[PDB]
Design a protein around this ligand. Structure first.
Ligand SMILES: *[C@@H]1O[C@H](CO)[C@@H](O)[C@H](O)[C@H]1NC(C)=O
Ligand SMILES: *[C@@H]1O[C@H](CO)[C@@H](O)[C@H](O)[C@H]1NC(C)=O
Ligand SMILES: *[C@@H]1O[C@H](CO)[C@@H](O)[C@H](O)[C@H]1NC(C)=O
Ligand SMILES: *[C@@H]1O[C@H](CO)[C@@H](O)[C@H](O)[C@H]1NC(C)=O
Ligand SMILES: *[C@@H]1O[C@H](CO)[C@@H](O)[C@H](O)[C@H]1NC(C)=O
Ligand SMILES: *[C@@H]1O[C@H](CO)[C@@H](O)[C@H](O)[C@H]1NC(C)=O
Ligand SMILES: [Cl-]
Ligand SMILES: [Cl-]
Ligand SMILES: [Cl-]
Lengths: 290, 291
């Protein structure tokens, strides 16, 4: 029995589709044989505990563009075969309990973008060993703690752009051995730890533009063996003696890199660091070469 | 009498080499029998017209990494057997007279990268039908005029990355029948004419990443029958109905391509267009948006 005004059909998968119905809550009586559930475009404000626990064969769950303000920690109990979870475009969600995604060992894609998330609680992504795509962009994250993605050994795409991340700690990207694309642009990153990119040996794309980086440590880009593309524009780069290690790296980098506009001193304003000669990077708590 | 700043010999070819000498100008008294001249790594600012005109057997001329601000239109007058000319790493050059490379029917490689070239004069690459490599990357090219490489029938490599080229006209690449690699990445390319790749049948590599391409007609990739490597990433792709032709092309293309990440709409942001479904490419000036 199909609930409400939803559409229930069997091919290509058993699907319960209830998009854009003004639903205030998850409808009861969803067929337990459902493999895909589409609840996007509604006004659902909360997801109570075990809202879909009868749908053991559920692989796809869409809840984006709702009015989510609270997701119960046990909301996804019994969904061991879930592969896709779309919770995006829920600007009033703000916080997800760190135990919410536990047990989702088959989860391959997780959409948490534009949800107003303020923090990433410890253990939020624990045990998601099959995760490949993590969308965290356009939130309100003001920190990127260590070991946040420790168990995500299969993650290939991580999107953190459009947040308020102030810095990149040493073990923020630990365990991300399969990461291919890391987009951190449009944040507030004022500093990166010297060994923060240790496990990113397979990273091909790294976006760091539109941040607040004045300098980059020495050999911080050394582990990036597979790096093909690098974006460092729109940053207050200080082009004095401290910029010599980055300048020498950009001359040897056989991949593609963007412009590195200098912000200080006044005479070198809007000058690409890659074009400059080594003689221009002379002079100056302060860096060691000062 | 070899110049004191230079080292002259003739074991492979007659060579007059004076690199990294701080020379203010071209040294006088260069042996006329020279087949290779290396003036790279100095502070030469001007290349007069009477220079090198005696070296009728000159094949290699190294002038990269200098302070070149002006090169006379007849600087390479009697250099008919000149095969390689390296003028790169001269940011203060800016302009090159369109008659500079006339008569160099034996020139195989031409380095003009990192010269601050703001434009490409008409007939600049005229007659250079022996040219195979053309280095124009990392300059300030604000346009790509029609028939710019019309006579470059033997050109295999064309490097045009790091400029500010806003678009690709219909006949910007006419005559490049032998073109093998075409690097147009890191520019301001916003639109490509539907027949811009007409004569690029033997093209294998095409880089268009880091540009301003919101859409790209699938008809422009039809002539590229030899295409093996395509990079379209880092573009403001709009993945709606207008991207359906480009999408169907990526499904049939069995060569290695980069990701085509969607910039708009927001729900498809950072999603690879190749991995999307045709149902995702619906809705919305493009002709499919209005109906
Ligand atoms: C789920 O799939 C299994 C195997 O196909 C089937 O036996 C079961 O009835 C389905 N529905 C459930 C567990 O609700
Ligand atoms: C991670 O990817 C590898 C490579 O395909 C695969 O063998 C493995 O099963 C994946 N891990 C999980 C938990 O799915
Ligand atoms: C970061 O840089 C932006 C410009 O890209 C600037 O508006 C902003 O004030 C900077 N913030 C800090 C903390 O430096
Ligand atoms: C160039 O070479 C030819 C034959 O090797 C020789 O006859 C001629 O004099 C040379 N040109 C000079 C030395 O200017
Ligand atoms: C173009 O190259 C071919 C061989 O690659 C050669 O036979 C031909 O003479 C060249 N054309 C010119 C004008 O030098
Ligand atoms: C990029 O291309 C768009 C056209 O879609 C244009 O509006 C914009 O000004 C361009 N920006 C730059 C920096 O060239
Ligand atoms: Cl708020
Ligand atoms: Cl560049
Ligand atoms: Cl470059």
């Amino acid at each position: 029995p199909c609930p409400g005004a939803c559409v229930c059909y069997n091919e290509p998968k058993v699907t319960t589709s209830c998009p854009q119905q003004g639903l205030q809550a998850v409808p009861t009586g969803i067929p337990a044989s459902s493999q895909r559930i589409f609840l996007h475009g509604n006004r659902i404000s909360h997801v109570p505990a075990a809202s879909f626990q009868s749908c053991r064969n559920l692989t796809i769950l869409w809840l984006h563009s709702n009015a989510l303000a609270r997701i119960d920690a046990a909301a996804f109990t019994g969904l061991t075969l879930l592969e896709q979870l779309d919770l995006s475009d829920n600007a009033q969600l703000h916080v997800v309990d760190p135990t919410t995604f536990h047990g989702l060992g088959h989860l391959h894609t997780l959409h948490l973008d534009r949800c107003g998330l303020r923090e990433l609680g410890p253990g939020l992504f624990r045990g998601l060993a099959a995760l490949q795509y993590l969308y965290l962009q356009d939130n309100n994250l003001q920190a990127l703690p260590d070991n946040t993605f420790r168990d995500l050994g299969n993650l290939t795409h991580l999107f953190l752009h459009g947040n308020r991340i102030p810095s990149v700690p040493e073990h923020a990207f630990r365990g991300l051995h399969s990461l291919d694309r890391l987009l951190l642009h449009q944040n507030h990153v004022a500093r990166v730890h010297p060994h923060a990119f240790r496990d990113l040996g397979r990273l091909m794309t790294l976006y760091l533009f539109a941040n607040n980086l004045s300098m980059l440590p020495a050999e911080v880009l050394m582990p990036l063996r597979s790096l093909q593309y690098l974006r460092l524009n729109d940053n207050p780069w200080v082009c004095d003696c401290r910029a010599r290690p980055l300048w020498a790296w950009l001359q040897k980098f056989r991949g593609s890199s963007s412009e590195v506009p200098c912000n200080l001193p006044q005479r070198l304003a809007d000058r690409d660091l890659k074009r400059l000669a080594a003689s221009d990077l002379e002079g100056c708590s302060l860096p060691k070469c000062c």
